[PDB]
Amino acid sequence: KRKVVLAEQGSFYIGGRTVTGPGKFDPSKPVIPYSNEGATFYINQMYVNFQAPVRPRGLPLVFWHGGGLTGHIWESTPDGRPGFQTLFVQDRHTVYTIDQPGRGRGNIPTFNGPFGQLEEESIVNTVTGNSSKEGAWVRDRLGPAPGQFFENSQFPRGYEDNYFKEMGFSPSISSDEIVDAVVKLVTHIGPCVLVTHAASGVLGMRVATHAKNVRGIVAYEPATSIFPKGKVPEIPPLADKKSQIFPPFEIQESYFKKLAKIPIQFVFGDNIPKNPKSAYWFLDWWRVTRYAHSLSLEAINKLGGQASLLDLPTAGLRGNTAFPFTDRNNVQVASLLSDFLGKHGLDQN
Amino acid sequence: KRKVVLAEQGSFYIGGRTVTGPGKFDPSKPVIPYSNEGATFYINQMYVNFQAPVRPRGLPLVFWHGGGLTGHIWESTPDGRPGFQTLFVQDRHTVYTIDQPGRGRGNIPTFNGPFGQLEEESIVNTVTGNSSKEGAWVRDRLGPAPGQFFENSQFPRGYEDNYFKEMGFSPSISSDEIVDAVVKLVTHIGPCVLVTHAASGVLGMRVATHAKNVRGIVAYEPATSIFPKGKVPEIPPLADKKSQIFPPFEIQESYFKKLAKIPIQFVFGDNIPKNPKSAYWFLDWWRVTRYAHSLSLEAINKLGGQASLLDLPTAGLRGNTAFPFTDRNNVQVASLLSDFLGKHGLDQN
Ligand SMILES: COC(=O)c1ccccc1S(=O)(=O)NC(=O)N(C)c1nc(C)nc(OC)n1
Ligand SMILES: COC(=O)c1ccccc1S(=O)(=O)NC(=O)N(C)c1nc(C)nc(OC)n1
């Protein structure tokens, strides 16, 4: 069912700062080709879209895309089925979707000169990085190697091109500045729930420690674990005995303690190996990253928290990739999110 | 006013191509940091959003942002009033809004290495260009100089930060590939109307010559004029005796003739001078650019066309900037667009 009734919708920019070029601007001189002379540039701002149902119930949801993505992933699946934006407006929540600084409609800070460089100042690095189709295939656990699917896969097969086309690079904007933009959004919205994904997992945890308005977190397949400073537990290397997972983020315990004050759920899909898998780097990476997250959640619970790990196969959902909210069974994944919101009173006024 | 009812909404990717790096991808080797080795990259694809009303009447509208912009400008004004997307869904048209290749949710083609470079191939230039706040202020005719506003201005004053935050750079993707993506969208949608803006004006004219499904064009403040090859009329230089407008695009006459088969309207806002203005480069640039467009429309009409130029002040609307569809009187601007659609039956089934 695709129909949606909106009391209002729209979009806006929030957050960011400015940087200035040298000299002054003279309106009599040729304006194009564009010059840094006399220039003010707005940088690192974030794009925000919202859709509000008639008579909303409970708190607004803020859907935060993973690494190299945009709010598209919450709008539609690669095969054109409704995304979580539609499903949760239908579930009577106001829905915010963002393009964080450096991605999509967010700002990419570059000027007149080599990419990212404002005269002698490097705002972001000129050298970029970006996953290939092959790297993303294994990262997202479509299968163990590019072009191969797990038998049980929930991926919308045949729509591979559409899926990979949604992904791209991110300039080297500091995570501090990304977190700052979302803190400002949360201040603007009021009490809300963060729904994060992969690279935005750790960022949403950070936002919650800075913003009391974050009343809950659901994180799909978070990519970086978080611990109190100096209390990082022993985490093994990968099965190749050379690689490590992403270095866990460390925060002062007084901020970490704030995570114990709200319900937090991490959600993982399928096909994460239980045992070392030296032949398949990313499968093994996910094994150890999921383990690190289990210890992070345990640390929150030892501070009086209510932090849980939901493995979708234990709820009867088999074959999900690292994007469960765009997989073929995404309605069932959404149902489990609604269950979490309902259990914690986040769907009541 | 804000209420919107959608039979369906969503988004998708269309267009683009692939490129690779050398070698073979080995899933046993560390996937991050990402490498070009064995890597397929999707480049130059376009993001498309659609909103369909219940029982649409007439043709879908494709709103195409100007230079350095995104579909945001059709979603909301800088001060948060409804954009043309909402207004035209309320007007019972299905509405498509795009982020063209190189902008917003469209692809920015960069890899592992200096920006835009895939090994020894330069996909886009590493050196970027980008307007400043000051350049955009005068380009868009908010006032003759930054900080100043024309009398009777329709700009949402006070929302300068929101407005300028929506603008950014474009990588050097060829115009051929941008046009190609929209031709593919037009094939997918069927008969439709293009609504263009500034830098997308000439691109929409080009699309129409390649796509019979374009049944009409409304272009707000187009930036580059178009003529049959070898038939560009004499166009004077600017009042500074040294600058010229953008070199007009020249197409083969057999393609130019296709513009004579559909209704085409160019729409200009206020404060374009009638006489040379050496003190204000962009005001004088608009004077001569608008003149060049008058001659382009005349050439279309000489070939049997239905091309017209609408100056908003002659229709009783004073003070519009170069973004009339986000100005304070944008509802009245929308009413004139509805009038055009109705005149030509583009609002009937
Ligand atoms: C949608 O996919 C993801 O969100 C994702 C998931 C797992 C691993 C890496 C990424 S990533 O593709 O974004 N990572 C990335 O681009 N890089 C390169 C990255 N990201 C992070 C968060 N840390 C590090 O190194 C510490 N690298
Ligand atoms: C939203 O504003 C515009 O759409 C716009 C409007 C008028 C002039 C220039 C631009 S522009 O900012 O895009 N131009 C631009 O960035 N440059 C640099 C440009 N664009 C074009 C289409 N041609 C040329 O040179 C021929 N330069």
Short mmCIF file of all heavy atoms in Angstrom, two decimals, chain B residues 140-186:
data_model
loop_
_atom_site.label_atom_id
_atom_site.label_comp_id
_atom_site.label_asym_id
_atom_site.label_seq_id
_atom_site.Cartn_x
_atom_site.Cartn_y
_atom_site.Cartn_z
N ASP B 140 21.77 36.20 -8.67
CA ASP B 140 20.35 35.95 -8.51
C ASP B 140 19.55 37.23 -8.39
O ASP B 140 18.32 37.16 -8.26
CB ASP B 140 20.13 35.02 -7.32
CG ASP B 140 20.86 33.68 -7.50
OD1 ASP B 140 21.17 33.33 -8.67
OD2 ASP B 140 21.13 32.98 -6.50
N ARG B 141 20.21 38.38 -8.47
CA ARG B 141 19.54 39.68 -8.45
C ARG B 141 18.74 39.92 -7.17
O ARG B 141 17.64 40.46 -7.18
CB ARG B 141 18.71 39.93 -9.72
CG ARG B 141 19.52 39.83 -11.02
CD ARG B 141 18.78 40.43 -12.22
NE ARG B 141 17.38 40.04 -12.26
CZ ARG B 141 16.94 38.89 -12.75
NH1 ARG B 141 17.80 38.02 -13.26
NH2 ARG B 141 15.65 38.60 -12.73
N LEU B 142 19.30 39.49 -6.03
CA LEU B 142 18.74 39.94 -4.76
C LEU B 142 18.86 41.45 -4.64
O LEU B 142 17.93 42.13 -4.17
CB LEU B 142 19.45 39.26 -3.58
CG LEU B 142 18.93 37.90 -3.11
CD1 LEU B 142 19.08 36.83 -4.17
CD2 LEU B 142 19.67 37.50 -1.85
N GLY B 143 19.99 41.99 -5.10
CA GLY B 143 20.27 43.41 -5.09
C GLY B 143 21.48 43.64 -5.97
O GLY B 143 22.09 42.70 -6.47
N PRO B 144 21.85 44.91 -6.18
CA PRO B 144 23.00 45.19 -7.05
C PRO B 144 24.34 44.84 -6.42
O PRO B 144 25.33 44.64 -7.15
CB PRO B 144 22.88 46.70 -7.32
CG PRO B 144 22.10 47.23 -6.16
CD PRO B 144 21.19 46.12 -5.68
N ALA B 145 24.42 44.73 -5.10
CA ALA B 145 25.65 44.37 -4.42
C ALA B 145 25.28 43.54 -3.20
O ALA B 145 24.15 43.62 -2.71
CB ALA B 145 26.41 45.63 -3.97
N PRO B 146 26.20 42.71 -2.70
CA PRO B 146 25.89 41.89 -1.52
C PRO B 146 25.45 42.74 -0.34
O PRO B 146 26.00 43.82 -0.07
CB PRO B 146 27.21 41.17 -1.23
CG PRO B 146 27.88 41.08 -2.59
CD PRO B 146 27.50 42.36 -3.29
N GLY B 147 24.42 42.26 0.37
CA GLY B 147 23.86 42.96 1.50
C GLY B 147 22.72 43.90 1.14
O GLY B 147 21.96 44.30 2.03
N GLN B 148 22.60 44.27 -0.13
CA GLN B 148 21.59 45.20 -0.60
C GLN B 148 20.44 44.45 -1.28
O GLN B 148 20.65 43.43 -1.93
CB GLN B 148 22.20 46.19 -1.60
CG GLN B 148 23.30 47.06 -1.02
CD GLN B 148 24.01 47.91 -2.06
OE1 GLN B 148 23.52 48.06 -3.18
NE2 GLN B 148 25.15 48.48 -1.69
N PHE B 149 19.25 45.01 -1.15
CA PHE B 149 18.08 44.42 -1.77
C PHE B 149 17.42 45.45 -2.65
O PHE B 149 17.37 46.62 -2.30
CB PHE B 149 17.08 43.97 -0.71
CG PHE B 149 17.47 42.70 -0.02
CD1 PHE B 149 18.24 42.74 1.13
CD2 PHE B 149 17.09 41.48 -0.52
CE1 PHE B 149 18.60 41.58 1.77
CE2 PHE B 149 17.45 40.32 0.11
CZ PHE B 149 18.21 40.36 1.26
N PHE B 150 16.90 45.01 -3.78
CA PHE B 150 16.17 45.92 -4.64
C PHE B 150 14.89 46.32 -3.94
O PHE B 150 14.35 45.57 -3.14
CB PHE B 150 15.81 45.23 -5.94
CG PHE B 150 16.96 45.10 -6.90
CD1 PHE B 150 17.46 43.86 -7.24
CD2 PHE B 150 17.52 46.23 -7.48
CE1 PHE B 150 18.51 43.74 -8.13
CE2 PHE B 150 18.56 46.12 -8.37
CZ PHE B 150 19.06 44.87 -8.69
N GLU B 151 14.38 47.51 -4.23
CA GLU B 151 13.11 47.92 -3.66
C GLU B 151 12.04 46.94 -4.10
O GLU B 151 12.11 46.42 -5.21
CB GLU B 151 12.73 49.32 -4.14
CG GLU B 151 13.56 50.43 -3.54
CD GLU B 151 13.04 50.89 -2.20
OE1 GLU B 151 11.85 50.67 -1.91
OE2 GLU B 151 13.83 51.48 -1.44
N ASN B 152 11.06 46.69 -3.23
CA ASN B 152 9.96 45.77 -3.55
C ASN B 152 10.41 44.33 -3.78
O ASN B 152 9.72 43.56 -4.44
CB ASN B 152 9.10 46.28 -4.72
CG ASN B 152 8.64 47.71 -4.52
OD1 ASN B 152 8.96 48.60 -5.31
ND2 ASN B 152 7.88 47.94 -3.45
N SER B 153 11.54 43.96 -3.21
CA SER B 153 12.07 42.61 -3.36
C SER B 153 11.15 41.52 -2.85
O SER B 153 10.53 41.66 -1.81
CB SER B 153 13.37 42.52 -2.57
OG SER B 153 13.71 41.18 -2.32
N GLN B 154 11.09 40.41 -3.58
CA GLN B 154 10.30 39.27 -3.14
C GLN B 154 11.16 38.20 -2.50
O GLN B 154 10.67 37.13 -2.20
CB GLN B 154 9.54 38.65 -4.30
CG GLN B 154 8.52 39.56 -4.94
CD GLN B 154 7.21 39.63 -4.18
OE1 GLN B 154 6.97 38.85 -3.26
NE2 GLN B 154 6.36 40.56 -4.57
N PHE B 155 12.44 38.47 -2.31
CA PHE B 155 13.28 37.49 -1.63
C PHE B 155 12.82 37.31 -0.19
O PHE B 155 12.46 38.28 0.45
CB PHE B 155 14.75 37.93 -1.65
CG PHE B 155 15.67 36.92 -1.03
CD1 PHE B 155 16.01 35.77 -1.71
CD2 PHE B 155 16.17 37.11 0.25
CE1 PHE B 155 16.84 34.83 -1.13
CE2 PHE B 155 17.00 36.18 0.83
CZ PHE B 155 17.33 35.04 0.14
N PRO B 156 12.82 36.06 0.31
CA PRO B 156 12.50 35.82 1.72
C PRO B 156 13.61 36.36 2.61
O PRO B 156 14.42 35.59 3.11
CB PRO B 156 12.43 34.29 1.81
CG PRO B 156 13.01 33.76 0.54
CD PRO B 156 12.75 34.82 -0.48
N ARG B 157 13.62 37.66 2.83
CA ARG B 157 14.67 38.33 3.59
C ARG B 157 14.70 37.83 5.02
O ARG B 157 13.66 37.61 5.65
CB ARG B 157 14.37 39.82 3.59
CG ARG B 157 15.54 40.69 3.95
CD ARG B 157 15.28 42.10 3.52
NE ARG B 157 16.32 43.00 3.99
CZ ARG B 157 16.37 44.29 3.67
NH1 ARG B 157 15.44 44.82 2.88
NH2 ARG B 157 17.36 45.04 4.13
N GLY B 158 15.92 37.66 5.54
CA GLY B 158 16.14 37.03 6.83
C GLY B 158 16.56 35.58 6.73
O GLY B 158 17.07 35.02 7.71
N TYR B 159 16.36 34.97 5.57
CA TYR B 159 16.66 33.56 5.36
C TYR B 159 17.84 33.38 4.40
O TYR B 159 17.93 32.39 3.69
CB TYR B 159 15.40 32.82 4.91
CG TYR B 159 14.35 32.85 6.01
CD1 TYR B 159 13.49 33.94 6.15
CD2 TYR B 159 14.27 31.83 6.94
CE1 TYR B 159 12.56 33.99 7.17
CE2 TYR B 159 13.34 31.87 7.96
CZ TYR B 159 12.48 32.95 8.07
OH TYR B 159 11.55 32.98 9.09
N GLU B 160 18.74 34.37 4.40
CA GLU B 160 19.92 34.31 3.54
C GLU B 160 20.77 33.08 3.83
O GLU B 160 21.25 32.42 2.89
CB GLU B 160 20.76 35.58 3.72
CG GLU B 160 20.08 36.87 3.28
CD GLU B 160 18.98 37.33 4.25
OE1 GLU B 160 19.05 37.03 5.46
OE2 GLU B 160 18.03 37.98 3.78
N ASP B 161 20.97 32.74 5.11
CA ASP B 161 21.78 31.56 5.43
C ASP B 161 21.18 30.30 4.81
O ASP B 161 21.89 29.52 4.17
CB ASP B 161 21.93 31.40 6.95
CG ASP B 161 22.86 32.44 7.58
OD1 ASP B 161 23.53 33.22 6.86
OD2 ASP B 161 22.94 32.45 8.82
N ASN B 162 19.86 30.10 4.99
CA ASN B 162 19.20 28.93 4.42
C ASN B 162 19.38 28.88 2.91
O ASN B 162 19.66 27.83 2.34
CB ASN B 162 17.70 28.99 4.72
CG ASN B 162 17.39 29.03 6.19
OD1 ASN B 162 17.54 30.06 6.84
ND2 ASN B 162 16.94 27.91 6.72
N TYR B 163 19.17 30.02 2.26
CA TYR B 163 19.24 30.12 0.80
C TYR B 163 20.62 29.76 0.29
O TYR B 163 20.78 28.87 -0.55
CB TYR B 163 18.90 31.55 0.43
CG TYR B 163 18.92 31.88 -1.04
CD1 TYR B 163 18.06 31.26 -1.95
CD2 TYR B 163 19.80 32.84 -1.52
CE1 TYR B 163 18.07 31.60 -3.29
CE2 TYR B 163 19.82 33.18 -2.87
CZ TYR B 163 18.95 32.55 -3.74
OH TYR B 163 18.94 32.89 -5.08
N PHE B 164 21.66 30.45 0.77
CA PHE B 164 22.98 30.20 0.23
C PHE B 164 23.50 28.81 0.58
O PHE B 164 24.30 28.26 -0.18
CB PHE B 164 23.95 31.32 0.62
CG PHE B 164 23.58 32.64 0.01
CD1 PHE B 164 23.15 33.69 0.81
CD2 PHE B 164 23.65 32.83 -1.37
CE1 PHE B 164 22.80 34.90 0.26
CE2 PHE B 164 23.30 34.05 -1.94
CZ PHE B 164 22.88 35.09 -1.12
N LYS B 165 23.03 28.23 1.69
CA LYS B 165 23.46 26.88 2.07
C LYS B 165 23.02 25.82 1.07
O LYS B 165 23.59 24.72 1.07
CB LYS B 165 22.90 26.52 3.44
CG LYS B 165 23.76 27.08 4.58
CD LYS B 165 23.13 26.83 5.94
CE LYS B 165 23.89 27.55 7.04
NZ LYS B 165 23.37 27.13 8.39
N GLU B 166 22.03 26.11 0.22
CA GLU B 166 21.55 25.12 -0.74
C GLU B 166 22.43 25.00 -1.98
O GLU B 166 22.20 24.09 -2.79
CB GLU B 166 20.10 25.42 -1.13
CG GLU B 166 19.96 26.46 -2.23
CD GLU B 166 18.61 27.18 -2.27
OE1 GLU B 166 17.78 27.01 -1.35
OE2 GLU B 166 18.36 27.91 -3.26
N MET B 167 23.44 25.86 -2.13
CA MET B 167 24.23 25.98 -3.35
C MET B 167 25.60 25.34 -3.18
O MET B 167 26.19 25.38 -2.10
CB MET B 167 24.45 27.46 -3.65
CG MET B 167 23.18 28.26 -3.73
SD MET B 167 23.54 29.99 -4.07
CE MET B 167 21.89 30.67 -4.02
N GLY B 168 26.12 24.76 -4.27
CA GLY B 168 27.45 24.20 -4.21
C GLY B 168 28.08 24.04 -5.58
O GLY B 168 27.55 24.50 -6.60
N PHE B 169 29.23 23.36 -5.58
CA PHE B 169 30.01 23.17 -6.79
C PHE B 169 29.44 22.04 -7.64
O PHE B 169 28.66 21.20 -7.17
CB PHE B 169 31.46 22.82 -6.43
CG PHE B 169 31.75 21.33 -6.38
CD1 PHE B 169 32.61 20.75 -7.30
CD2 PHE B 169 31.18 20.53 -5.40
CE1 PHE B 169 32.89 19.38 -7.24
CE2 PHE B 169 31.46 19.15 -5.34
CZ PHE B 169 32.31 18.59 -6.26
N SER B 170 29.85 22.02 -8.91
CA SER B 170 29.55 20.91 -9.81
C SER B 170 30.85 20.40 -10.41
O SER B 170 31.65 21.20 -10.94
CB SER B 170 28.60 21.31 -10.93
OG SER B 170 27.43 21.92 -10.42
N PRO B 171 31.11 19.09 -10.35
CA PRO B 171 32.28 18.55 -11.04
C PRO B 171 32.08 18.66 -12.55
O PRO B 171 30.96 18.84 -13.04
CB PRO B 171 32.30 17.08 -10.60
CG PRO B 171 30.85 16.77 -10.33
CD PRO B 171 30.30 18.04 -9.73
N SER B 172 33.19 18.55 -13.28
CA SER B 172 33.19 18.81 -14.72
C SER B 172 32.59 17.69 -15.57
O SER B 172 33.13 17.37 -16.63
CB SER B 172 34.60 19.16 -15.18
OG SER B 172 35.49 18.07 -14.98
N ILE B 173 31.47 17.09 -15.14
CA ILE B 173 30.77 16.13 -15.98
C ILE B 173 30.31 16.82 -17.25
O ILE B 173 29.83 17.96 -17.22
CB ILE B 173 29.56 15.56 -15.23
CG1 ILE B 173 30.00 14.89 -13.93
CG2 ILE B 173 28.76 14.58 -16.12
CD1 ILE B 173 28.83 14.40 -13.09
N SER B 174 30.47 16.15 -18.38
CA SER B 174 30.09 16.76 -19.65
C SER B 174 28.59 17.01 -19.70
O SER B 174 27.79 16.23 -19.16
CB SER B 174 30.51 15.86 -20.80
OG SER B 174 29.55 14.85 -21.02
N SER B 175 28.20 18.11 -20.34
CA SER B 175 26.78 18.38 -20.54
C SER B 175 26.11 17.28 -21.35
O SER B 175 24.92 17.00 -21.14
CB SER B 175 26.60 19.74 -21.21
OG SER B 175 27.10 19.71 -22.54
N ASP B 176 26.85 16.64 -22.25
CA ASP B 176 26.31 15.51 -23.01
C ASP B 176 25.76 14.43 -22.07
O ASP B 176 24.68 13.88 -22.29
CB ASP B 176 27.40 14.89 -23.88
CG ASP B 176 27.68 15.69 -25.14
OD1 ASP B 176 27.09 16.77 -25.34
OD2 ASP B 176 28.53 15.22 -25.93
N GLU B 177 26.52 14.11 -21.01
CA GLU B 177 26.11 13.04 -20.11
C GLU B 177 24.98 13.48 -19.18
O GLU B 177 24.16 12.64 -18.78
CB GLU B 177 27.31 12.52 -19.32
CG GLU B 177 28.31 11.79 -20.20
CD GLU B 177 29.34 11.04 -19.40
OE1 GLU B 177 28.94 10.12 -18.65
OE2 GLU B 177 30.53 11.38 -19.50
N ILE B 178 24.91 14.77 -18.84
CA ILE B 178 23.76 15.25 -18.08
C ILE B 178 22.50 15.16 -18.92
O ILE B 178 21.47 14.65 -18.47
CB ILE B 178 24.02 16.68 -17.58
CG1 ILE B 178 25.14 16.66 -16.53
CG2 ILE B 178 22.74 17.28 -17.00
CD1 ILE B 178 25.75 18.03 -16.27
N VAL B 179 22.57 15.63 -20.17
CA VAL B 179 21.43 15.54 -21.08
C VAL B 179 21.02 14.08 -21.26
O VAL B 179 19.83 13.76 -21.27
CB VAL B 179 21.77 16.22 -22.42
CG1 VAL B 179 20.72 15.89 -23.50
CG2 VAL B 179 21.90 17.72 -22.23
N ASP B 180 22.00 13.19 -21.40
CA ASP B 180 21.71 11.78 -21.61
C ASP B 180 20.87 11.21 -20.47
O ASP B 180 19.94 10.42 -20.71
CB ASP B 180 22.99 10.98 -21.73
CG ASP B 180 22.73 9.54 -22.11
OD1 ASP B 180 22.18 9.33 -23.21
OD2 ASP B 180 23.05 8.64 -21.32
N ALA B 181 21.20 11.55 -19.23
CA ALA B 181 20.46 11.01 -18.11
C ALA B 181 19.00 11.46 -18.15
O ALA B 181 18.09 10.67 -17.87
CB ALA B 181 21.12 11.41 -16.79
N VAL B 182 18.77 12.73 -18.49
CA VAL B 182 17.39 13.21 -18.51
C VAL B 182 16.63 12.66 -19.71
O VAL B 182 15.42 12.37 -19.61
CB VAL B 182 17.34 14.75 -18.39
CG1 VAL B 182 15.92 15.24 -18.47
CG2 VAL B 182 17.96 15.17 -17.07
N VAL B 183 17.30 12.46 -20.86
CA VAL B 183 16.63 11.79 -21.97
C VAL B 183 16.14 10.41 -21.53
O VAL B 183 15.01 10.02 -21.82
CB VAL B 183 17.57 11.72 -23.19
CG1 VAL B 183 16.97 10.80 -24.26
CG2 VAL B 183 17.81 13.10 -23.77
N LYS B 184 16.98 9.68 -20.79
CA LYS B 184 16.58 8.36 -20.30
C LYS B 184 15.41 8.46 -19.32
O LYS B 184 14.48 7.64 -19.37
CB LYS B 184 17.78 7.64 -19.67
CG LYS B 184 18.77 7.17 -20.72
CD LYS B 184 20.00 6.53 -20.13
CE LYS B 184 20.70 5.70 -21.19
NZ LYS B 184 22.16 5.98 -21.24
N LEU B 185 15.40 9.48 -18.46
CA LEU B 185 14.26 9.67 -17.58
C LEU B 185 12.99 9.94 -18.37
O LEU B 185 11.92 9.38 -18.08
CB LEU B 185 14.54 10.81 -16.59
CG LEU B 185 13.33 11.17 -15.73
CD1 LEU B 185 12.94 10.00 -14.84
CD2 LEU B 185 13.64 12.39 -14.90
N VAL B 186 13.08 10.80 -19.39
CA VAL B 186 11.91 11.14 -20.20
C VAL B 186 11.38 9.92 -20.93
O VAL B 186 10.16 9.72 -21.04
CB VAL B 186 12.27 12.30 -21.15
CG1 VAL B 186 11.27 12.42 -22.27
CG2 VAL B 186 12.36 13.60 -20.36
#
